[PDB]
Design a protein around this ligand. Structure first.
Ligand SMILES: NC(=O)c1ccc[n+]([C@@H]2O[C@H](COP(=O)([O-])OP(=O)(O)OC[C@H]3O[C@@H](n4cnc5c(N)ncnc54)[C@H](OP(=O)(O)O)[C@@H]3O)[C@@H](O)[C@H]2O)c1
Ligand SMILES: O=C(O)Cc1nn(Cc2nc3cc(C(F)(F)F)ccc3s2)c(=O)c2ccccc12
Length: 315
């Protein structure tokens, strides 16, 4: 199936378009091309500073009757400087206004760590450490629950929560809505078997981010592993007459994950969608799992002292 059933009763397309780092001047056309060639899920965030432009594309494709709003699955995320209870609705409403929507299909706590509120996304002290907010995930989660009860979002979820944090939500006293999704980094170099099985065992759908290893991440270095250039992955693609990127997108799909590759390149947007016509073998899958090396694209040094930093622990 091209959609997975969430625990709020709604279906979610297992392929979406990512938008982190998509330039504001190219992402409108990017999203337009993606809807044209079949994408029905867009992954967004206020912190990506491009939601206005993403929204232009969505609204034009609705106006043009290329798609109906019910057919779209639009995701956004609450940024760390808005974890305070009095800030969550407004933050969601800004995202909605920019996306030109009246509801989101899914809204995620973007990271478990709350940062000091302000105009700065990454407020730092004079030594470079991120400045925390004294908020905790449970009260943040309660705030998210209110968005559901106000009709602003159809589903709520979390992102970059480790096993212990997910379990803390599930065990929250007075828990009203379980998280629908946990969006986490996942690719052959960071395979996440434990976290994913934990989440799935609990009926929480996992979305895999940076499935191609984020070659355009701004902190990339020479000695870093490179998925798209891995000869072992290239050979598996070769065997299937597909591209390395296609193998890397199909890989999570077959683990019952949602995957959200980013591109602003029209030929690549289209290539990336052509992944429903082939299957990796079970041996291919285990072989790709074997390349795990616990390598993370996303884990900003400045945040590692936050009490709620998610990656000190195994998973
Ligand atoms: N929850 C969070 O914390 C979090 C964190 C990171 C990412 N995410 C989401 O996940 C999405 C995807 O992750 P990502 O942006 O880090 O990286 P990614 O999707 O792993 O990689 C994007 C990079 O791959 C290139 N690319 C795309 N398709 C390609 C293809 N077929 N062949 C060769 N190169 C290709 C893109 O180039 P062009 O664009 O130039 O074509 C871009 O440089 C994000 O955009 C965001 O929506 C969420
Ligand atoms: O956020 C995105 O979607 C992509 C993303 N990732 N990162 C690396 C990060 N690593 C983190 C670690 C924590 C931590 F929780 F671990 F403290 C909290 C927050 C972050 S941001 C960034 O620095 C970033 C900056 C602008 C826009 C998007 C991003």
């Amino acid at each position: 199936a091209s959609r997975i059933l969430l625990n709020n009763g709604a279906k979610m397309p297992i392929l979406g378009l990512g938008t982190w780092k998509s330039p504001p001047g190219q992402v409108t056309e990017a999203v337009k091309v993606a809807i044209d060639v079949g994408y029905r899920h867009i992954d967004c965030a206020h912190v990506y500073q491009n939601e206005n432009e993403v929204g232009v594309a969505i609204q034009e494709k609705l106006r043009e009757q290329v798609v109906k709003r019910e057919e779209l699955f639009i995701v956004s995320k609450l940024w760390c400087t808005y974890h305070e209870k009095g800030l969550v609705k407004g933050a969601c409403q800004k995202t909605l206004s920019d996306l030109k929507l009246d509801y989101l299909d899914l809204y995620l706590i973007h990271w478990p760590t709350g940062f000091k509120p302000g105009k700065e996304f990454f407020p730092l002290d004079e030594s470079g450490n991120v400045v925390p907010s004294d908020t905790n995930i449970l009260d943040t989660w309660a705030a998210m629950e209110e968005l559901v009860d106000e009709g602003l979002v159809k589903a709520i979820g979390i992102s970059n929560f480790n096993h212990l944090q997910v379990e803390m939500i599930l065990n929250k006293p007075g828990l009203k809505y379980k998280p629908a999704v946990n969006q986490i980094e996942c690719h052959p170099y960071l395979t996440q078997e434990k976290l994913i099985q934990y989440c799935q065992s609990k009926g929480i759908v996992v979305t895999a981010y940076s499935p191609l290893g984020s070659p355009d991440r701004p902190w990339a270095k020479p000695e870093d592993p490179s998925l798209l250039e891995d000869p072992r992955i290239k050979a598996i693609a070769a065997k299937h007459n597909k591209t390395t990127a296609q193998v890397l997108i199909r890989f999570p799909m077959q683990r019952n994950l949602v995957v959200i590759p980013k591109s602003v390149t029209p030929e690549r947007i289209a290539e990336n969608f052509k992944v429903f016509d082939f299957e990796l073998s079970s041996q291919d899958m285990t072989t790709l799992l074997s390349y795990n090396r616990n390598w993370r694209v996303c884990a900003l040094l400045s945040c590692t002292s936050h009490k709620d930093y998610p990656f000190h622990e195994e998973f």
